[PDB]
Amino acid sequence: MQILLANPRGFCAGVDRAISIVENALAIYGAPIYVRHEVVHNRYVVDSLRERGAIFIEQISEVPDGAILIFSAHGVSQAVRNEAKSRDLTVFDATCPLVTKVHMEVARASRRGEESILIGHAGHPEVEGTMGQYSNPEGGMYLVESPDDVWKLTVKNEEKLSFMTQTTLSVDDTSDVIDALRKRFPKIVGPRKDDICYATTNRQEAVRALAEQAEVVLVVGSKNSSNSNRLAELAQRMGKRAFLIDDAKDIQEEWVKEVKCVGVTAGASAPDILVQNVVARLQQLGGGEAIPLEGREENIVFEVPKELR
Numbered sequence: 001m002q003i004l005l006a007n008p009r010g011f012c013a014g015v016d017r018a019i020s021i022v023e024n025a026l027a028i029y030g031a032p033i034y035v036r037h038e039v040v041h042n043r044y045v046v047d048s049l050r051e052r053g054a055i056f057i058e059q060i061s062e063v064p065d066g067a068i069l070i071f072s073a074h075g076v077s078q079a080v081r082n083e084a085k086s087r088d089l090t091v092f093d094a095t096c097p098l099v100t101k102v103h104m105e106v107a108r109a110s111r112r113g114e115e116s117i118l119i120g121h122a123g124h125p126e127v128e129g130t131m132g133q134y135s136n137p138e139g140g141m142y143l144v145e146s147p148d149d150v151w152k153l154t155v156k157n158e159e160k161l162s163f164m165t166q167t168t169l170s171v172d173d174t175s176d177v178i179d180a181l182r183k184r185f186p187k188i189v190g191p192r193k194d195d196i197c198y199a200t201t202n203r204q205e206a207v208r209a210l211a212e213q214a215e216v217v218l219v220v221g222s223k224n225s226s227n228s229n230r231l232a233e234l235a236q237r238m239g240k241r242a243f244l245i246d247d248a249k250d251i252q253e254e255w256v257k258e259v260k261c262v263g264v265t266a267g268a269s270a271p272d273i274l275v276q277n278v279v280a281r282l283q284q285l286g287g288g289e290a291i292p293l294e295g296r297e298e299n300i301v302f303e304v305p306k307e308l309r
C-alpha cells in the first residue's frame with residue numbers, strides 16, 4: 001500500500017498566529033486565559049490549550065470581571081466586541097487577518113447604507129462575525145448558501161449591491177453561487193473572484209491532485225472544521241471514499257483493506273503531529289514510506305501583536 005501526502009496540507013498562517021496568540025498570553029500573564037469559542041476548530045489544539053489553562057467559553061457573560069479574553073480566529077460581531085468593551089476585560093484579538101479583510105468591506109457597505117449579500121453557511125461563527133459587521137437599518141445584509149437561495153432573495157435596491165464570502169468555502173460551489181448572483185443582480189459588485197483565502201484554495205487544489213492518484217482519502221480535521229469538510233467532500237465527489245478523522249484511532253481497518261494507494265491530507269487547523277500518527281497507523285496496516293506530492297509553495301506568515309511577543 002502506497003501512502004501519499006497532499007501538498008499543501010495542515011496549518012495556515014491565520015491558525016498559526018491564533019494558536020501563538022493564546023500560547024503567548026498564557027506565558028506572559030499566566031493561567032487562566034479566557035477564549036471565546038474554540039480558538040480554531042481542532043479538538044487536539046483546543047484540548048492542548050485547555051490542559052494548559054486556557055478556558056473556552058461561548059458568551060462574554062461567562063467571563064469574570066478583570067479577566068483576559070481572546071477572540072477566536074473566526075472573528076466576532078461588533079455586538080460581541082462591544083459587550084467585551086463595556087466590560088472590565090483585557091482583550092486580544094486572534095481573528096485571522098483574512099477574515100478581518102472581509103469584515104472591513106461589510107462595515108464599509110453598512111456606512112454607505114448599501115445592501116450586502118454574504119455567501120456562507122448559516123450558524124458558522126465566521127458568518128455570525130461577518131454578518132455582525134453590518135448595522136445600517138437603511139440597507140440590509142442577507143446570507144445565501146446556494147443558487148436556490150439567490151433565486152428567492154429580494155433586496156431593496158438592486159442597483160446598489162455588493163457581495164462577500166466566507167473564507168473556507170468550496171471554490172467550485174461558491175463559483176456557482178456567484179454566477180447565480182450575477183444573473184439575478186447584474187449590477188452587483190464584488191471582489192474579482194471571491195473572499196476564499198489562499199490556504200482554502202490551495203488545500204482544495206492539493207486534495208484534487210491527491211484524489212487523482214489515491215483510491216481512499218483520509219482528511220485529518222475535526223467535525224466542526226468547515227475547511228476540512230470541504231476537502232473530504234471534494235474527494236468524495238471525485239468518487240473516492242473519503243473520511244474526516246481527528247486522529248489515528250478513528251481509522252477503520254476495512255477502509256484500507258486491499259487498497260493499493262491511500263492519500264492523507266489535513267485541514268488548515270490540524271497540527272502535523274496528527275498526520276504523523278495517522279501515517280504510523282497506515283504503516284501498521286501495511287503501507288510504506290509516506291511520499292509527499294509536489295505542491296504549490298506557501299510563503300505567508302502573520303506575526304502576533306507586538307504586545308504578545
Ligand SMILES: C=C(CO)CCOP(=O)(O)OP(=O)(O)O
Nearest residue numbers: 040041073168225226227268269
Ligand atoms: C481558523 C479559521 C478562520 O478562517 C479557519 C481555519 O480553521 P478552522 O478553525 O478549522 O475554521 P473553519 O471551520 O472556518 O474551517
Ligand code: SF4
Nearest residue numbers: 012014096098167197
Ligand atoms: S483558513 Fe484562511 S481565513 Fe481561515 S484562519 Fe486560515 S488563512 Fe485565515
